[PDB]
Design a protein around this nucleic acid. Sequence first.
RNA 1: GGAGGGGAGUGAAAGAGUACCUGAAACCGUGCGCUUACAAUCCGUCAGAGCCCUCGACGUGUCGUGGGGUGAUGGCGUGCCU
RNA 2: UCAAACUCCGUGAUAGCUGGUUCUCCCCGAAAUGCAUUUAGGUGCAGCGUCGCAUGUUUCUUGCCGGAGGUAGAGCUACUGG
RNA 3: GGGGAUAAGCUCCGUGCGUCGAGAGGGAAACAGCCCAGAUCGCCGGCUAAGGCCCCUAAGCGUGUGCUAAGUGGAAAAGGAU
RNA 4: UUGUGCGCCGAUAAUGUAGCGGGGCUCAAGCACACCGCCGAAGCCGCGGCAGCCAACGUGUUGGCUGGGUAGGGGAGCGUCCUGCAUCCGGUGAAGCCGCCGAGUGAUCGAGUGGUGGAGGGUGUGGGAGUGAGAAUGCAGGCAUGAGUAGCGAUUAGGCAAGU
Lengths: 124, 100, 146, 54
Amino acid sequence: ARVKRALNAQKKRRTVLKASKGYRGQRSRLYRKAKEQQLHSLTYAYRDRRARKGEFRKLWISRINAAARANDITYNRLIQGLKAAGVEVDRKNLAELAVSDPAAFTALVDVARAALPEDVNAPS
Amino acid sequence: TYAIVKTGGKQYKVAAGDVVKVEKLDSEPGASVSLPVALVVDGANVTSKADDLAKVAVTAEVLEHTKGPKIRIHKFKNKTGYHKRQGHRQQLTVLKVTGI
Amino acid sequence: PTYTPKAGDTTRSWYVIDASDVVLGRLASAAATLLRGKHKPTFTPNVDGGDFVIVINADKIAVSGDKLTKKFAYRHSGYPGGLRKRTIGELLEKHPTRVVENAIIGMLPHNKLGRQIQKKLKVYAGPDHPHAAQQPIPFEIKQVAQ
Amino acid sequence: AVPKRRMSRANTRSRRAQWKAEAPGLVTVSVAGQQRKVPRRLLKAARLGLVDLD
RNA sequence: GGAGGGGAGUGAAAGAGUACCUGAAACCGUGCGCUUACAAUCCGUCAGAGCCCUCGACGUGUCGUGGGGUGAUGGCGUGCCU
RNA sequence: UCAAACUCCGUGAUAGCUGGUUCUCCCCGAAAUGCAUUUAGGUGCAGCGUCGCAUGUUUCUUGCCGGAGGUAGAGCUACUGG
RNA sequence: GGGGAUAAGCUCCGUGCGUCGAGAGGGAAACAGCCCAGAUCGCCGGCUAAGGCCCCUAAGCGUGUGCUAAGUGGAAAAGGAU
RNA sequence: UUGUGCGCCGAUAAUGUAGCGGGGCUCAAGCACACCGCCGAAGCCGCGGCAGCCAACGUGUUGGCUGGGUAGGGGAGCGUCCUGCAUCCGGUGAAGCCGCCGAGUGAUCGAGUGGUGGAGGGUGUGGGAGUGAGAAUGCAGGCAUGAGUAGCGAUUAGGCAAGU
């Protein structure tokens, strides 16, 4: 029985072309270029999903450092004091507190200062 | 007043009435759950001592079990002919906070 | 989710920094930090949330070593043999502002946003500035001890 | 010399947009009573009835 | 002038008019929404301001376990096959 | 069209050479070494992969014990040479 | 270790040596073979390796004792130098 | 004089700074030795989803290890056509095509719907394949870039008035 290849190819062509909407130039019209761009786009998405956590952590660290320096304390000393004090709030909510509730961040800075050792450079 | 609640290896800043998506929990919709607290900020004074945090908990009701966005994975390497298609829909629960 | 500035959230303040007896690198780094907006808790690399910076006493900048007569500021016109070199000494004696401008500009991103941030830096060789109507806040370069 | 590459849609359309015709300027005229538009270059000719006007 | 077309008719249908069943893709237009003339872009991906549309609730506009379109701006990023 | 014309047929000539060979996922996963070759860009066997059957730690690492070298070093009226 | 002029980003052998080949991620500005480390998928959680903490660029214009005047740092020899 | 830690000339090519990645730094942001923090990967941990092997007890749950991968080996499946058998849908509108809203671990799916269309299709279980193209300076048809660009084919030459 002779079989025509229309439907089987048209299915995947429709899916690939629909997935490539919004692209510029040939990448949104022609199936081959759209498929190449789909490969690249999905690889980029997979890599960026992994890198997004680090990107957001870097942004939170920047905001926390800015807020802490506004309270006359460095980010690293503040983190060490917070770890010593036992407060387990992560950097995401720390940055949220810094942006939204400066009083809570000031209180946390105070408790971190309290928890820090007397001479940070001592061999202890 | 609001508190930072730990659940599913993560922490969320919530108050009374907030709806927050949370990693899957073995609870039927409409039930109630109690979760630990990483920090309580009531008005001005901030509760941060470990034992004070242990003495308090956040009670929330499970709204529904849902699924996250569909994620398409197509691993690929040039000059190789190696492809690997894969999909994933993370399971989630929707929690409405009742009080602290 | 993480906070993101909206249209009306950004606010600017004016800082005036005196450059009399200041190491050029230190002053330029402080000015770049102020312009970038890195000192605000609401910082976001997407947005230009920096602050307007005024620099006076530009001609009084301090340059250590022998960099006054051995450091060159190069520029090429594009024509053959169009390279021009001037030491920091003649550049300061001729265009006192340009030294601080180049120093600060070299320290901030070379993106389009960096070009936009450059619009918020005004330097003056004299001891006074015409921006008194904005009532700038004096700024002192301090170090947070750890 | 031959083109090394196929021109993209943007460049082709941008250069193609410069091939256009300008609209001639028309002024009115009164011939045989009825008013009609005639280019100012042909004003005198129309007034002397040297231009066929449909 | 014709070609062609607009009414009027025949037809169940003229989105069946002897260029005629169904009418895809490439390619070429028209209208609307967003964006673009200080900008070095394997042209995408992750964040993302703004504008427009849409689904609910409460008032007269403002949020939400919302969804869409376009996306200024930042990070990353050396087409496919042999 | 000529260092042996053109057409059909043998004919779907033959090329250790070149190019191409189309849907998906799960598990394991190499080699570029030896011998031989009218042999070196090919191939046969061996080595390494996988599947099934059989056999069970026989594999591997560490400690201890029993063994043979003639390397590094060193040495020379202990030999032979410079 | 041999050949070559112990010159080659030269060539030929040995190595329960490594990596790439067949290997993503971080670092060395970029950079198959170097360094850290072997990616089952998701997270807007945490601790670290190599490498780093003045700005670009995340984190120290960190603390203590000394040296450097050469921008040495941020290329190189015989040799010369109160 | 003796050795040391740093330095100094030696030092030196042809597009443009060019032998810190850039700015800049000796008020070290340089070097040596000590000390204290932090950043830092798809590494490890936390929560959740899947799969392979094995073990335990059960009449499929739990638990432990494992899950980069070309040549290649094995296993399991998606889609298309024609058919035996059994059922279901269809001029109250099948196929085909264009969308919306969704779904699956993948090939993909929608007896969910909106438009167009006008006569055949779906499902289960078997049987057989001309059964899946992105590339062979691949073939046929249609159409783009170059581009409204080159050219409009000699060395004689056309003009005016009238007419159709």
